[model samples]
Target: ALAAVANPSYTRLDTWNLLDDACRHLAEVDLAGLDTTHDVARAKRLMDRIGAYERYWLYPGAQNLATFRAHLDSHSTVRLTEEVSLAVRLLSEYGDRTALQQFYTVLLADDSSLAECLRQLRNPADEVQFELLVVASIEDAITAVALNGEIQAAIIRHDLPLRWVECAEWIRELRPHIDLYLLTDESRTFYRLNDVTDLHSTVLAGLRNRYATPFFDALRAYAAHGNIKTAMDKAAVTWNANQTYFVTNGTSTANKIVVQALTRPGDIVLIDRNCHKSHHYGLVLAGAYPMYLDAYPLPQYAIYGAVPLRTIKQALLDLEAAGQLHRVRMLLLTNCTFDGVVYNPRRVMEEVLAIKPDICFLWDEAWYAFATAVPWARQRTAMIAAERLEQMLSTAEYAEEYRNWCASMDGVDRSEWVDHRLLPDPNRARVRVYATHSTHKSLSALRQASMIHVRDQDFKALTRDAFGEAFLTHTSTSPNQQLLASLDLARRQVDIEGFELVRHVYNMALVFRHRVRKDRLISKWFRILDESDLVPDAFRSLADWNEAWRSDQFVLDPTRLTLFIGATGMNGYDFREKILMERFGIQINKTSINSVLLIFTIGVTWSSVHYLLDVLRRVAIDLDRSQKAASGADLALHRRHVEEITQDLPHLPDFSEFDLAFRPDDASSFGDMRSAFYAGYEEADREYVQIGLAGRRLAEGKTLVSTTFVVPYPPGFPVLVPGQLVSKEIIYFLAQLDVKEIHGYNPDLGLSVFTQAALARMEAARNA
Candidate 1:
């Protein structure tokens, strides 16, 4: 009767009710009857069923269930009635999985009485619960935290089969934002983590703390603060910067703040044409004249490469010819662009400084913040490069070398050596560098958390007040306190385990690349890109992908995996949006015409890599089956799509020169983009024309100029800026775009252009 009542069909309440009646009846049965043997066997089977359910449903879909069952079989024997009671209790507590989803689950790496005690503990109001997921061994504990993204905290018992301290450290590096605790039974002692008092605020206090009595009372304010300022100063030292400031508004505003502080109206600034759109908007706000430098095009891949040393030097030389080199204030570029083409900051800055000794550099390193952990990559980052350059310039040996190099180039024309390589005069150059980082991009920080590091030699004399004013202008008075705390903790984690974490990611990327190449099935449909595929030979120094870490020139970040899908007979947009994302539940952010980018950050697990590989193999098999059974029309359609991606690629358009009205003067090549930006504020100054019909207007002796930025997704930068003329190539590129997202452009009304009347008024104003 007891065995019959232990079925899943009955509710927990019904099972307990039936269990009580069965116990009373079983008390009256014969003690040694031959028929009772069958009941005994049935009771044993019931116990086995309860154990199986416990293993499967304890934490639903846990990957370590098989190992956990083996441990249960070997370690200790549990009673049948006790196991059933424990299972019933767990179901009652966590059966309402919908409500329990609101709580933060914590993993307890202990199967002792302490784990049961923690599981039973509850908040007074039942508002904030810490659901305990108990595991027996350290291996299971690590697997639990890695596979489940919802496990927000972990408690490590002092006594475990494995090294508890190493496990704790590994967990912390994997998910730095989680709340970690070390529990000991010697004196029932509990230890919290991190020197930052508010690192585990949610664990200490409830999630919704209406009053600041527990966590916020001791926290420092963000605006004019004490501990906050001290924390930023400490972070500055880690980055090897003279000063650092915390930003709560991401690198978008951080870019604007630096530009506004450094450049004045009409000051010529040379900037990369393919940089982040924020830089172009920053120029508009700062009222600075911009000279846009174009990067080399990767036409085969439908993406733009990094700006070459020759391109930048040619722009500076052109400015020198126009007698405006001294007026140039800053040179801006993005380090390690979205597709993973990294620039050698030390080499680029050294060559540029040789031409204009005091030009400031603003490096937008939004995705390369973790590069400081790697030794070779560290030397190319802005902060370390500036420090090394400053130290090198102060040495007598470097000065003597610089003089010798100049002596060798005595008979050579200045133009000949400027584009190739030029050493700066040690006494003439000053290290004035600024770099902005989006902490959440590659590190463990909240969204909108960023930092700006500075190594300016003229901070106090020339830029102190201006920088302060810009900070005040862009920063919010009331910032998210939790985000600020996260930035502090992220910095601490990087300082502690950043080297191991970054190296692990690099090694994993290498392994992943090898697996894709070695697996014949995967290589048939998808090919992982290498340095030679993305970068031109003239720009890079490495002969093989494995030697990328040693190269000082343009090198591909191994962590960024760009997979070409042209062989799959699908464009990047459809493959990412329909197949990989919708069918397989894989998430990726950046994509181009022929490829999709996958990044391996420190948080990546081995399971994730294996899952991706399996998915790709399955996808390739599915495609193979479909192709074998395809009809003529279906095969032709597939062939057409592949040809469109591989053969019908459009050439990326360079920025056309600005209209005469937007130039600072007739002899100057720099454009006052700020003035033209505001001129379009009036509705009468702008009009829309269809992209197909714009060519007719250009051919009719009318110059079509852009009134605003026209940006596309594949190459996510502005192709046309305010006051810049629109060429046939720009219109053609827009019409050929297969991407759905084109910011600042209306497909129905077409491209926004300046009216003739607005151009005439601007020209009259320029003449006056």
Candidate 2:
């Protein structure tokens, strides 16, 4: 339960193990004796020994501390010793009193032992060291009794701090009430096993029983009824949005919420083919027919880039030509796609809004939340361009500088940056705009916390009430209040210190990239995604650029470090398995055939950067030494591994049957691509079967029901959707996915084809 408070990746796991050894001294104490004259002299003596170092460091004075020291002098230091009562309180507010509260809290946990945790917490070789130690220590100690899972879940009362200060106060009150969970309280009683209370033999009834907390009460969707609601609005403003709403269910629900609000039954929604599966779920929930836009890959990087604007335009044009334009309601695109390629949203939205002025535009910026936080990344966002317009027009000083800045960008066509639509005017907006952010993914919120930002006014009348109706369908009745609090904190973090935070992460990445490139052995084996201009002269392959990226040249997100290892004649999985895990004990975010992606958050330290480089150096040196002795056996092993992974792919007996079913001779009969999709959903049950001899079955009579989505792990977009006939094209594409068990795949191997029954349920739910 303590683990829930901090990011698992950022929390040090070893500290929790320290708990077992912590219960050394004063293990058993009468609740009355805990606040008495006992054990005071020993603690005072220890403090006296450590007092010399206190002035040496010139420690900050805490509040009410002198009074507490005087109070302790009067009572047995034991009573005042429960004075060391709270760790966080001492750390936060100890005024001029020489005793370290951090040391005192550790003693409290040690049953007054004054052990190693005090010294460990005092060590500050790292900037975040003290904070991490305090948080971790407090968390483990607080949840010690609750660890058995018998305690009732507690909620943060409305008036208390959910952060450290509140946590400390709660702990101070809790040590006495803990007798309620374990065996130490004012009652001097312990909960007996098998003598159940409500759910458990007994349950902790602490904060909630004491106060009528206002948590999970029906909240106003538009107005700020409380501090939490008020903070959320400010966060939306910081994110450059007119309206914002929190979805505790993460961006998946956020996507569905937006789709449900925009489109209705049988409506057409153009979806980025590389979107999360939740978008497909939204289509099912809303009964909306989807038109997919394909993403293209960069030849040099071998990674998928953005869905070209041409593809979006072409798809819309086809729909319009087929007279199905009216039904098209919303268009969705994953900006800064999973592989870290951000699209120029201004241009795409301009073209899209032109074709269908009422079309609702959704840009899923879940992974790109940090983009607007950094200077270089901000330049790639629509926010910066909009801010530029506001900056130039609002201030005379800025307007004077704008002309010179415009002249400097002479050859560069930044027409998209000067968008007239985003001017600070409410009257001329053309379309409804939406941006979704998964705050947990990058902005340091708790998991499943996400925000959806809405434009004030554009296409159609959208009200908070209408949006609330859609939101309530997904919002939890008893939402995690901490998650909401964390969202507000995350927003504030980005608004205030985000620039410096991202700068540190970015510089660390830059240093690592430069060092890797400079090493001759490592340079031969791996390459990091650095800016095109930053690439050294010898690394010509990394310097390639596309002319179309002029207005918003792809600025590499320094936080996302993609290391390419294809040069070593090893697949990403090969290197990840053979070297990364075994040699370095580090795991990355995602893996492609040639690259592994590692994201750096604010939690990253310089040591993390150096450690990764050192691992790379060791692996590179080993490879260099072994290159000369490379044998056919190693090559054959890699080839065999690839073959084994791909061995079960469906082989076609007669490609013509699939060709005849999919590529119809009569294009006019289909009406439009939208109707063609509708027809496929309707036909899935009648035409397709999920079977082992899929290729042979297709050859004879069967066609695949695209109802079941088959996506491999690496790039998690579906290869097959509900409205398409499975053909060799899909089969060929599926041949490349890394097989994983969790998402239920082997897309490149044997397929988990959906039958008519499953297809019927999906469509029936839609039609119903």
What are the lDDT scores of the predictions, listed in order? 0.73, 0.52
| Model 1 misplaced regions, further than 4 Å | 1-225, 542-551
Report the poorest 10 consecutive residues by lDDT, candidate 2.
127-136
> Tens-digit lDDT track for model 2 on 94-136?
4212343211111112221112422333433322111111111
Model 1 RMSD vs true structure? 12.8
Model 2: CA > 4 A from native: 1-224, 299-302, 382-431, 530-550, 553-555, 629-702, 735-768
Best model per TM-score: 1
